[PDB]
């Protein structure tokens, strides 16, 4: 299934290197991972924790941090920011 990210999410994916406008959810997850990795938002010591306060990703997630093992804010963000084609 193909999705079109809303502008603010699309901005983030492009920072992370995405050249597409339409994505699969798998590709969106790939580029979010890339973004977090590139911007070094993960906690250095406990790397399942992602600190996104004072980053545009935090504005989309509406949270200052999240755990890769408690990913619902990520998924809820994607629900708000992906239009299914």
């Amino acid at each position: 299934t193909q999705v079109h990210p809303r502008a603010p999410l699309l901005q983030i994916l492009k920072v992370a290197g995405a050249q597409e406008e339409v994505f699969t959810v798998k590709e969106v997850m790939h580029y979010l991972g890339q973004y977090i990795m590139m911007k070094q938002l993960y906690d250095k010591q406990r790397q399942h924790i992602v600190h996104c306060h004072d980053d545009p990703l935090g504005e989309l997630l509406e949270v200052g941090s999240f755990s890769v093992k408690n990913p619902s804010p990520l998924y809820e963000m994607l629900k708000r920011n992906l239009v299914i084609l």
Partner: peptide, 12 residues
Amino acid sequence: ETFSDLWKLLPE
């Protein structure tokens, strides 16, 4: 261990 390792385990 590493963020990359952990991110790969996310259910899509």
